[PDB]
Amino acid sequence: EWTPDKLRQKLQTNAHNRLELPLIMLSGLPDTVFEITELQSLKLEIIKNVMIPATIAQLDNLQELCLHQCSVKIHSAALSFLKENLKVLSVKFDDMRELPPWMYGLRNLEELYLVGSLSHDISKNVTLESLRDLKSLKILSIKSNVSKIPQAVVDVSSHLQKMCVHNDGTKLVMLNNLKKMTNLTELELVHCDLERIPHAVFSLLSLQELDLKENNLKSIEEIVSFQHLRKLTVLKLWYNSIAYIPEHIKKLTSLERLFFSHNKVEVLPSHLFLCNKIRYLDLSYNDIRFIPPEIGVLQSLQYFSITCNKVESLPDELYFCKKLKTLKIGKNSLSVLSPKIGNLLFLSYLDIKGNHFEVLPPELGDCRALKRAGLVVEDALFETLPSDVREQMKAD
Amino acid sequence: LRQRLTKNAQDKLELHLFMLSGIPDTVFDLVELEVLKLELIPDVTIPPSIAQLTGLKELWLYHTAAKIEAPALAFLRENLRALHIKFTDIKEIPLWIYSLKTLEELHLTGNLSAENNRYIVIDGLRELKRLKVLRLKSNLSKLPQVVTDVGVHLQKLSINNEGTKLIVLNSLKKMVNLTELELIRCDLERIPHSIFSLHNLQEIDLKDNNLKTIEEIISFQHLHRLTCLKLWYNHIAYIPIQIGNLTNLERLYLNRNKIEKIPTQLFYCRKLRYLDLSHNNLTFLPADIGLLQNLQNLAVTANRIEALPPELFQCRKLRALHLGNNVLQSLPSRVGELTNLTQIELRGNRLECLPVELGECPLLKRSGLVVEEDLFSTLPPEVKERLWRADKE
C-alpha cells in the first residue's frame, strides 16, 4: 500500500523543529519508512499492535518519537539502537496498553512528554519507576491526573531540569517527593488543584521557574524562605485567585519574570513596587483600582501589562521609568493619557483599545520607539491625529 | 504513465520504474520523458522504440542487468548523456556502457574493487571520451590508474568509500581539468597534496574525511579559483588564521564540526556568502561579521551563542538567518533594518519574546518566520496581521 514516494511526500516538520512523519490511522508501520534515513521523528497516531523491525537502524538521524494511542512493540536490536540513539519521547495513553513498557528501557532519554490519562494507582506503576534507568532525563511533562507524586519522580531527582504536570482538577499530594528534588530548575505545576503553595514547592532549593497556573492559591506567605531560591528568576502565578501581594516578595532579589494576571487583586500594593529588580510584571485583566506612587522604584521594569484592569487613575511616577518597553493599558478605566510620555525612549508596545478617551494629544508623536503597527488604536482615533503625527509612526 | 511522470532536482521530467517484471513499451512510447529510472528490473532487453524517447537524456540503472538491441545501442550512443550504475556484483554492470560516446556523467556506485576485477572491468572507460562527472561510491582502497588515464578530460571526481582511506600518491597531477572534487566519507584524516597540486578546482568538498587538523590551507592560496570549501562533517576543532589568505571563498561550509572559536582572520574574507557554522561549539559571534557584507545565509543552528551582536545586523544582505536551536536570549530590534531576510529560524531558542521590528522585513512570511506559536503571539495583532497577511498575500 505505501510506496517510499508517498512517505517522502508525507514528510513535514513538527512543533520541535524536527523532520516528523505523521503516520495517522494505519494498521502498522510500513517497511518503506526506514528508507527515509534523514527522518528525525515519527508521529504514530492510533496505530496499535505495531512491531518495529531492526531496520530502524537505518534511521541514524532519528532522535524523537511521538506515540499517540499506539500499543507498539519493538524488536531487540531495534531496542538497543533506540537505546543508543533516541533523546525525546512523547507518549499519549488514552488506554493503559497504549503506554508501552519498552519505552523506559532506553537510557539516552532527555525529554519526555507523558500526556494521557493515568489511573489513580500511581505508586503501583513500576513502569514509571523505571525512569531511574534514564541517565539524562531533564524534561518530564505529565499531562495526566497526578494525584500523588510518584517515587519515579524521586528516582530522577537530580538529572531532571524541567518538571511539568497538568493534573486537570486533582489535588497534588505526597509532598516529600517534590521535597526530594535537588537539581530541578523548572517546576511547571499547571492546575494541580493546589489550595495554596505546597510546602514541597517551597522545599525546592534550586528552582528557577515556578508555574502554578490555574492553581487556586490563597496566599503567598512562607516567602521568608524564598531567599534560598536565589537561582529563581521566573515566578508564574497568573490565572489564579490571589487577592494580595505582601511585602515578603522582597526576599528574592533575583526575580525577573513575575506573573499575576487574571487574579483577584483589587488594589496593587506599593511594597510590590519596592522591589526594583523585577523586569517583567504581568497583571492583565486584574481588578486593580489604582497604582500607588511607589512604582517609580521599578526602573528596570520592561513589561508592565496593566491592560483590561479596573485602573482609573494612573500616577505620573510610572512614566518616570523609561525602560518600560512593552506597556499595555488597553481596555482599562482611564480618562486621559499623560502628556509626559516622551521620556520613554524604549517603548515599542502601546495598546489603548477599548478605553474611553476624549482627544488624543500630539504628545503621542513624542514616543521614539513607537510604531503604527505597535500602536494599536482604532481607525476613528487614527483619523484624529495630525498628518505629521500620523507619519511619525506610520512611515516605519 | 502520464500521471506517473514527475520532476527531479534538475527540473527534468521523470519516471521511476520500481520492481517490474520487465519494462513497458508504453513507457518507451513516451516523448516528453527526460529521466527514466530503472530500479530492480531483472534481466530486461531495451527495445529500439527508444527512438520515440527523444527527450531521454539520463538513464538511471539501479540493480538492472540490461541487454541492448543494436539500433537502440546506436541511439543511446548518439543521444544518452548521463548514466548512473548501481550494482551488487561486478558482473551486473552492462558491457555496452563503454560503447556509449555521448555520455558525460557516470555514477558508478557499488564496489569496483574485486580480485582481478579491480578496475579491470572499468578499464573500458578509456573508450569513454566526454566523461566529465565520475561519481564512485565504491569502497575504493586505492584510486584507480584508469582514472589517472581518463582525468585529462574529467571535471568532477566524487569518491565515496564509506570508510576506506585513499592512498592518493599525488596522482591527480595528470588530472588537470577538474573544477569540482567531492571526497565524501573517505576517512582521509588529513588533506592530501593532490588537491594542492591541482589548480583548476573551484568547489572542494571534504565531507566526513575525519579531518582533525586543517593546517595545510595556507597553501590553498595557490588555488586561485576555489569558491566553495565544504569542510563539513569532519573533526575540525579550530580554524587556522591562514584561511584569511583565502579571499576567493564564497561558501564556507564548516557545519557539524568541533570548532569552538572563530578567529578574526577568517572574518577578513569579504567574499563569503554562505557562512554555515551550524552544529558546532561556537559560544560567541565576533562583531567583524558586519564587515562580511556579502553574507546571505548565516546558519549558526545549534550553537552556544547567547547574544547576537548588533554588528551582525550591519550586514544587510542576510537572507536566511538560521538561529534555531541556539541559546539566544533576545533578538535585537536591528533586524528591522534587514530587507533581504526571507526565512528566519528562532524556534528552539531561549527567546523570551519576538520584537515588533521583526515585522519590518518585507519579504518575511509565516513559512519563512518559523517560530513557536506563543512566540508568534508576542507580536502585535496588527503586526501579526501583517505577517499573517504575508502568509496569505
Rounded to an integer, what distance in angstroms lies between the CA atom of residue B22 and that of residue B43? 8
Rounded to an integer, what distance in angstroms lies between the CA atom of residue B90 and that of residue B371? 50
Place of cell 504513465: B1
Which H/E stretch holds residue A382? Answer: helix A379-383
What distance, in Å, lies between the first and last C-alpha atoms of chain A? 54
Ramachandran bin of B212, using left for φ above 0, alpha for ψ from -120 to 50, beta for the remaining angles = alpha
- The Cβ of residue B49 has, within 10 Å, a number of other Cβ atoms equal to 17
Which H/E stretch holds residue B386? Answer: helix B381-392
Per-residue cell: A279: 523586569
Rounded to an integer, what distance in angstroms lies between the CA atom of residue A287 and that of residue A285? 7
Contacts of A371 in chain B (CB under 8 A): 356-357, 383
Per-residue cell: B129: 571520451
Point out which residues pair with A211 in neighbouring strands: A188, A236
Place of cell 539566544: B328
Which of B16, B325, B380 has its CB closest to that of A373? B380
Per-residue cell: A304: 508592565
Kindly give the pairing relationship between strand A186-190 and strand A162-166: parallel
Question: A317, A293, A290: which is closest to A306 by C-alpha?
Answer: A290
3-state secondary structure at position A186: strand
* Under 8 Å between Cβ of A206 and A230: no
Rounded to an integer, what distance in angstroms lies between the CA atom of residue B34 and that of residue B40? 20
* Chain-chain contact of A17 with B324 (C-beta, under 8 angstroms): yes
Residue type, position A178, single letter:
L
Distance from CA of A366 to the nearest CA of B (A): 19
> What contacts A253, CB < 8 A, 6 or more positions away?
A230, A275, A277
Residue type, position A63, single letter:
Q
Minimum CA–CA partner of A280 in chain B: B352
Contacts of A41 in chain B (CB under 8 A): none
Q: How many Å separate Cα B268 from the centre of its chain?
A: 25
* DSSP conformational letter for B126: G
Distance from CA of A16 to the nearest CA of B (A): 7
Rounded to an integer, what distance in angstroms lies between the CA atom of residue B337 and that of residue A279? 26
* Under 8 Å between Cβ of A297 and A269: no
HSE-CB at B278 with a 13 A cutoff on CA atoms is 15
A213 and B CB contact within 8 Å? no
Which of B325, B359, B383 has its CB closest to that of A17? B325
What distance, in Å, lies between the first and last C-alpha atoms of chain B? 35
Rounded to an integer, what distance in angstroms lies between the CA atom of residue A78 and that of residue A54? 4
3-state secondary structure at position A201: helix
Residue type, position B212, single letter:
K
> What contacts B231, CB < 8 A, 6 or more positions away?
B206, B211, B214, B252, B253, B254, B257
Resolution of the determined structure in angstroms stands at: 3.2
Breaks (C-N over 2.5 A) in chain A follow: none
* DSSP conformational letter for A173: B
**CA distances, A301 to each of A295, A369, B325, B380 (Å):** 10, 16, 28, 20
Distance from CA of B178 to the nearest CA of A (A): 30
* Chain-chain contact of A348 with B356 (C-beta, under 8 angstroms): yes
> What contacts B3, CB < 8 A, 6 or more positions away?
none
Distance from CA of B19 to the nearest CA of A (A): 11
> What contacts A387, CB < 8 A, 6 or more positions away?
none
* Chain-chain contact of B356 with A396 (C-beta, under 8 angstroms): no
Rounded to an integer, what distance in angstroms lies between the CA atom of residue A6 and that of residue A2? 6
> What contacts B105, CB < 8 A, 6 or more positions away?
B58, B81, B82, B83, B84, B131, B132, B133
For the residues of A214-238, what is the DSSP string, one character each? T--------GGGGGG-TT--EEE--
Ramachandran bin of B256, using left for φ above 0, alpha for ψ from -120 to 50, beta for the remaining angles = left
Number of A to B CB contacts under 8 A, please give it. Answer: 37
Rounded to an integer, what distance in angstroms lies between the CA atom of residue A44 and that of residue A91? 9
Which of B18, B348, B383 has its CB closest to that of A374? B383
Which of A13, A16, A373 has its CB closest to that of B359? A373
Residue A345's φ and ψ, nearest 5 degrees, are: -70, -40
* Under 8 Å between Cβ of A16 and A88: yes
Rounded to an integer, what distance in angstroms lies between the CA atom of residue A45 and that of residue B143? 49
Which H/E stretch holds residue A7? Answer: helix A4-10
Rounded to an integer, what distance in angstroms lies between the CA atom of residue A383 and that of residue B326? 44
Distance from CA of A47 to the nearest CA of B (A): 28
HSE-CB at B210 with a 13 A cutoff on CA atoms is 11
- Angle, alpha carbons A5-A7-A10 (nearest 5°): 110
Per-residue cell: A392: 511619525
Per-residue cell: A296: 517609580
Question: A341, A345, A396: which is closest to A374 by C-alpha?
Answer: A396
Residue B344, judged by CB atoms within 10 A of its CB (0-12, 13-18, 19+), counts as buried
Rounded to an integer, what distance in angstroms lies between the CA atom of residue A305 and that of residue B157? 62
* DSSP conformational letter for A172: -
Rounded to an integer, what distance in angstroms lies between the CA atom of residue B313 and that of residue B338? 7
Rounded to an integer, what distance in angstroms lies between the CA atom of residue B203 and that of residue B232? 13
Rounded to an integer, what distance in angstroms lies between the CA atom of residue B45 and that of residue B66? 6
Distance from CA of A3 to the nearest CA of B (A): 10
Rounded to an integer, what distance in angstroms lies between the CA atom of residue B94 and that of residue B68? 9
Mutate to test the interface with B, among A349, A372, A379 (most CBs of B within 10 A): A349
Rounded to an integer, what distance in angstroms lies between the CA atom of residue A181 and that of residue A164? 13
Strands (E), chain B: 6-7, 13-18, 35-39, 44-46, 58-62, 66-68, 82-86, 105-109, 133-137, 156-160, 180-184, 203-205, 228-230, 251-253, 274-276, 344-345, 369-370
Which of A13, A349, A396 has its CB closest to that of B380? A349
Question: B146, B137, B96: which is closest to B117 by C-alpha?
Answer: B146
Rounded to an integer, what distance in angstroms lies between the CA atom of residue B340 and that of residue A243? 50
- The Cβ of residue B249 has, within 10 Å, a number of other Cβ atoms equal to 21
- Give residues 323 to 352 of B whose Cβ lies within 8 Å of A: 324-325, 333, 345, 347-348
3-state secondary structure at position B82: strand
Task: Give the total residue count for chain B.
Answer: 393
Residue type, position B15, single letter:
L
As a dihedral over the C-alpha atoms of residue B221, residue B226, residue B231, residue B232, rounded to 10 degrees, the angle is 160
* Chain-chain contact of B353 with A326 (C-beta, under 8 angstroms): yes
- Give residues 119 to 178 of B whose Cβ lies within 8 Å of A: none
Rounded to an integer, what distance in angstroms lies between the CA atom of residue A146 and that of residue B48? 72
* DSSP conformational letter for B275: E
Question: A270, A276, A278: which is closest to A246 by C-alpha?
Answer: A270
- Angle, alpha carbons B141-B146-B149 (nearest 5°): 135
As a dihedral over the C-alpha atoms of residue A332, residue A335, residue A340, residue A346, rounded to 10 degrees, the angle is 20
Per-residue cell: A108: 539516552
The 3-state secondary structure of B170-218, one letter per residue: CHHHHCCCCCEEEEECCCCCCCCCHHHHCCCCCEEECCCCCCCCCHHHH
Which of A17, A348, A349 has its CB closest to that of B348? A17
* Under 8 Å between Cβ of B315 and B295: yes
For the residues of A344-374, what is the DSSP string, one character each? --S--EEE-TTS--S---GGGGG-SS--TTT
3-state secondary structure at position A257: strand
Helices (H) and strands (E) in chain B, counts: 6, 17
Per-residue cell: B217: 590551507
- Angle, alpha carbons B34-A12-A68 (nearest 5°): 140
- Give residues 358 to 387 of A whose Cβ lies within 8 Å of B: 371-374, 376
Minimum CA–CA partner of A13 in chain B: B370
Question: A203, A272, A206, A271: which is closest to A237 by C-alpha?
Answer: A272
Question: B80, B98, B224: which is closest to B150 by C-alpha?
Answer: B98
Residue type, position B346, single letter:
L
Burial B255-291 (b: 16+ CB within 10 A, else e): bbbebeebbeebbbbeebbbbbbbbbebeebbebbbb
Rounded to an integer, what distance in angstroms lies between the CA atom of residue B266 and that of residue B286? 11
* Under 8 Å between Cβ of B200 and B176: yes
* Under 8 Å between Cβ of B56 and B37: no
Question: A287, A269, A220, A229: which is closest to A248 by C-alpha?
Answer: A220
HSE-CB at B19 with a 13 A cutoff on CA atoms is 2
Distance from CA of A224 to the nearest CA of B (A): 29
Breaks (C-N over 2.5 A) in chain B follow: none
Question: B371, B113, B358: which is closest to A16 by C-alpha?
Answer: B371
* Chain-chain contact of B360 with A396 (C-beta, under 8 angstroms): yes
Contacts of B347 in chain A (CB under 8 A): 17
Rounded to an integer, what distance in angstroms lies between the CA atom of residue A72 and that of residue A101? 9
Question: A3, A9, A12, A11: which is closest to A31 by C-alpha?
Answer: A3
- Angle, alpha carbons A40-A44-A45 (nearest 5°): 145
Rounded to an integer, what distance in angstroms lies between the CA atom of residue B86 and that of residue B201? 27
Contacts of B355 in chain A (CB under 8 A): 348
Rounded to an integer, what distance in angstroms lies between the CA atom of residue A65 and that of residue A21? 10
> What contacts B304, CB < 8 A, 6 or more positions away?
B281, B282, B283, B326, B327
Minimum CA–CA partner of A370 in chain B: B356
3-state secondary structure at position A31: coil
* Under 8 Å between Cβ of B124 and B99: no
Per-residue cell: A47: 496505530
* Under 8 Å between Cβ of B114 and B89: no
* Under 8 Å between Cβ of B288 and B310: no
Residue type, position B228, single letter:
C
Distance from CA of B322 to the nearest CA of A (A): 12
Question: Which CB contacts under 8 angstroms, 24+ apart, belong to B259-265?
Answer: B262/B286, B263/B239, B264/B288, B265/B241
Place of cell 574529467: B154
The 3-state secondary structure of A69-131, one letter per residue: CCCEEECHHHHHHHHHHCCEEEEEECCHHHCCCHHHHCCCCCEEECCECCCCCCCCCCCHHHH
Rounded to an integer, what distance in angstroms lies between the CA atom of residue B142 and that of residue A385? 79
Contacts of A5 in chain B (CB under 8 A): 16
Residue type, position B45, single letter:
T
